Write a structure and sequence with these properties.
monomer, 121 residues, alpha+beta, 6-stranded antiparallel sheet, 3 helices, globular, binds the ligand Cc1noc(C)c1-c1ncn(C)c1-c1ccncc1, Histone-lysine N-methyltransferase NSD3
Amino acid sequence: VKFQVGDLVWSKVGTYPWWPCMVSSDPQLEVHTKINTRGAREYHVQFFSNQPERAWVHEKRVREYKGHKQYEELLAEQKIRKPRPQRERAQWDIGIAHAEKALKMTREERIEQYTFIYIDK
Ligand SMILES: Cc1noc(C)c1-c1ncn(C)c1-c1ccncc1
């Protein structure tokens, strides 16, 4: 267990680029980490965005968030680069702005400021 609740991380999920996140406790499982059905470790994260979402992410797709400029280093992991779609870039920029504000906070302040409120349907 390398991450705890309130830690800032980058997550690489689905078709999306490396995205700013905060580790949090799953609202139903009440754990922030688990061993999945394939026997691998996963972390529960909140994506920083104007569209709040959460996901369980494989530990190999999670990295410590040290700052927004670290994005280049994650891409490093003729030069070939994927283009950046406008709508997705705008959502990522909002997320980064939140992550940069969260980085100036203590872990306790971040937990209080950003932990999602979940409402049953
Ligand atoms: C979208 C969406 N809906 O559920 C999940 C999970 C996602 C998702 N998967 C990976 N990223 C980066 C996201 C995401 C979440 C919020 N805003 C922008 C993107």
